[PDB]
Amino acid sequence: PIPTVEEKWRLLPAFLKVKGLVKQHIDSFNYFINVEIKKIMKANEKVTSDADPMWYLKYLNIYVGLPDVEESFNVTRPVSPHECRLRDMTYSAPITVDIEYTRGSQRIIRNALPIGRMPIMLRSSNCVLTGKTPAEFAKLNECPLDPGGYFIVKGVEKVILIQEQLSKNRIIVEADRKGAVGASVTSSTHEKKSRTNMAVKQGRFYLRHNTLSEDIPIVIIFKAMGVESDQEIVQMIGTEEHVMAAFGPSLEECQKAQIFTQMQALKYIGNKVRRQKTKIEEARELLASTILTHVPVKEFNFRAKCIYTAVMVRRVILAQGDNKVDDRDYYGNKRLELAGQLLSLLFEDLFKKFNSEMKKIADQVIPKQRAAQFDVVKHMRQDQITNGMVNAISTGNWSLKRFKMDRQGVTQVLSRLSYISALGMMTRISSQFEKTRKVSGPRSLQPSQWGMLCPSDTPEGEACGLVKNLALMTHITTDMEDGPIVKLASNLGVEDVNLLCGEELSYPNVFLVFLNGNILGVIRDHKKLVNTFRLMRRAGYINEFVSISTNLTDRCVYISSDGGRLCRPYIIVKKQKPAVTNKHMEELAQGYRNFEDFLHESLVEYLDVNEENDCNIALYEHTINKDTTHLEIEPFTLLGVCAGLIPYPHHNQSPRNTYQCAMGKQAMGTIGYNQRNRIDTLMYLLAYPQKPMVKTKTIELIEFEKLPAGQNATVAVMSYSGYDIEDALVLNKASLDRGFGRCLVYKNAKCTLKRYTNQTFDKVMGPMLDAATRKPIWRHEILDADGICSPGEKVENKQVLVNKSMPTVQPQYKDVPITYKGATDSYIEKVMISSNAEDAFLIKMLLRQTRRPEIGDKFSSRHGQKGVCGLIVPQEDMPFCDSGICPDIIMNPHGFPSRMTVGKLIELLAGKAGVLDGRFHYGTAFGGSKVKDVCEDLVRHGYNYLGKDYVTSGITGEPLEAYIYFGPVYYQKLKHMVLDKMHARARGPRAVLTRQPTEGRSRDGGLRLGEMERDCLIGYGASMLLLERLMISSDAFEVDVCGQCGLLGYSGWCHYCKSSCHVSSLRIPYACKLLFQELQSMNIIPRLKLSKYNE
Amino acid sequence: QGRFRGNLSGKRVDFSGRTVISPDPNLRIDEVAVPVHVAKILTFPEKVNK
Amino acid sequence: ADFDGDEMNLHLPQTEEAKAEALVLMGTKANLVTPRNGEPLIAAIQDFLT
């Protein structure tokens, strides 16, 4: 036995209270509008003209205020998010900057100059929705359970997906069709990205770059960098007999070419390179800060560049000849990008564009001037910045020419289908890889990710791993500095690289220091180094988000401090024992000694993906050994948000787990606390949501019991008459009539109307009365006297909602009344009339439709088991067992072995035991309750111990031989009903370009018949049916052709030969004649040859 | 979205439909149930004999 | 078919002469053997077997 502490499960709520699930999306923005907004400001602060050096601009300070709206004139009032969501406005706040401009002779400092607007998060620090109370949240018409984190642009909710990319400032060694190849990608703080690569062929190294035309030997670059003696080159490369035999060809090639001085080397580089100032100067500037930008040069010293290139050559030498390669699927190097850095680049580009634009408008007005004073405030606009930001957020196409980058599909509409789909959208992460079938590694589950990305959470279909979600315990590191770090490193006793020579780095005891892809220097006794660094990090002087690891194969220590890394808190162990004791958790239960105090007392610590590579972690406390360094807090944290709704995930299979994770966001339910006030395009509601009996701790962590999307129902696993096919499940008519599974659909209909540049306006006719009675016409029946429909009425098919009359050019108006399109008859809930930001009238209407479950609906069991309805079974059937309880939904026992789902039976058992006892049972992953203490509790009441009951059939009236599995199960209703997935078309609209049915079921179109089914018709041998339903019912046209000269005539008359004798008619589909008449513009004349079919 | 493999090869036809299938072991092997709403939309032309 | 989320479609022939070509060649009673092997593909379902 070992002392166990069953109290570390309360550390996770305390850690989630400060940050975690969705708060990091807001911290990425709050740190951005407080640091990076000032960073770009101090980047571009002074701009000067070119006409005369007397005019100049300066910036004092910049900041962003509170969300405000500019109404009719000189009226700034605080706006609410729901107000913008209902008026289709945009949630933005102005940016107040302090500018200084020198006009005439004196200097002017105009404070509080507005230059534009900028969107604000829903739960940011500058917004109103922060630090409030639920009573005050209800006064603003906003759900308090809304996690937020999205953008409101033109009355839609847009979320920016986190995107993963490869790390910069690093050396990669890959393998291709020829052999091994090394590469280095560099990107500094300024706008210049480079990608150099060293290739090996027939034992000769070559360097390739984007600006270089042909390959140049590495020894030439060495001699050009500044090292003259060839001995020092090999000395820097490596002091070994086998690395010198592989460097012989390069040495003899450098000796063959007449290159022995630095000037000759630079001349050769200038002759080789092509750029579209002599050759020596351009060759020197090309090697200074062009190929490698992440390595700064003080004046002209290439010593550090030489050392880096020597380490790269040694790496590519040690790689070649062995079976060691570096892979890109490793997540220790892959970095994440939030919405902060994208906004940073966008704002920097927009600010530079705005500074360069006004510089160009005020340069040709000073020479050709008519006054003595020139004010820059009058020649200023604040519309470009706002328009650019709004368009970049709405469209989602990040196009930056200064960075030379184009990205599409970054922002997506926030799915408001359910409460889980809305939160799960914030945790979605997309990859930069395209839809490639060939790639399988990155899609496959990687051993690197452990507790950072949920394995089960992934979409089923084409994207089988490209889309991933975060875990419960996950934190993204922000940006920091490196001054104190390098200072402490130099104080520890790290030697400078400029002191030692090339032969020392080859020594095994010698170790190199790497910091964000930069060689810090040489150090001995790296173990004491790492120990002291970790002690200083645990102390509190250095920030906690600093990663340090060691590599013995490469013999170097890596120090990672850049922003965008993955880390999760781990409990520290002290040589046989966790530092966390019971007295430390009793204080946390009391209310003191929070996560911050625990991190300040050296109790827990964050570790990176590469940092945990050099340590031993124990799962439980009984597994803790003498080599373990860190301890897992909770093992059920590995599962994701959508995976926390599955009872007993370890009992279920991974395909079923993935299916249930995919279907959890598809189930309909309650959206929030204000669902009747919000007016979205499509919304689904349930009637009476029940509470899950066997809930999970993750359910309580997110408070899913307050907005459930399912219902509990009695299930009996047994076969029925004829409708228990593999997924077909039957329903109970009496329960359906009582109201089990009643759903509601809500559709939005919005109509905007504005003015024009002339005096032409719009108007609404309204009701139309006849001469017989004083009642409205059948067309405008729901129309009221004003001109809009009244709420609380019923609209049938082909009914006018609102009368819209638009001027054609006193002016003649054309009537375009919007008509409701639907199969069933909807109902009117409410009508909202408001004004937009462009002084335009906007009328919104919400149409409700209550539906009931019928044959053809899709239901799920929250266990990866989806099924369509069978037959509706009445109440005379559904035999009772002993008391008179009828099965609500009969389940088929033939699909259980195929799916291999054992968690369903345990779920049913635990639910029955709970509903009998009267307390909810926990079913969390890697724990919960067993089947031994629950089986003995089901006996006290009087039922059978596991699942069996005596059932007497109701159809015949005799007892059943075998026993039936009865119990309550949590079911959920999904979308894709039979009423919407049902359409037919016989004769409707067609296209004008080609006479064929239109695409889509909303435009009354038909179905497509491709070659997939045409090959099946050909294999049979039927040709009349193939031409009947590809030519007769698709497109049939009569065309006249001449036999002498094949051409298209008209009314049996040719215009080329001028003869009426030679003429005939044929049946040709419109597509063929279309192609024949379209190919004539390519200087091609299709001449047909008519032959006698009879003879 | 061309004209060789977009219009000629595709050539989508009318007088058709699509709906979710349901089990019904009460018919023969060559039988199928058609909903009334769909049967009312579809039409078959025939010439009148004696 | 999987009978869980499948969407199956249906066509109606327009020409009377082609109505006879789909009855003799594309017949359910006729097409019971598969061309590749020669075994009957329509035997039963797991429920009927049990």
Binding site: G461, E462, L682, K975, E1011 | - | -
Partner: peptide, 30 residues
């Protein structure tokens, strides 16, 4: 015979289109 790739040379047909249903919610005619 040149070393080409089937994917880039042969353009995607109806054969390639894998008909599969996923939740993806949220021209002149005469």
């Amino acid at each position: 015979q040149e070393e080409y790739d089937e994917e880039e040379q042969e353009e995607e047909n109806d054969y390639i289109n894998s008909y599969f249903e996923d939740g993806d919610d949220f021209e002149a005619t005469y």
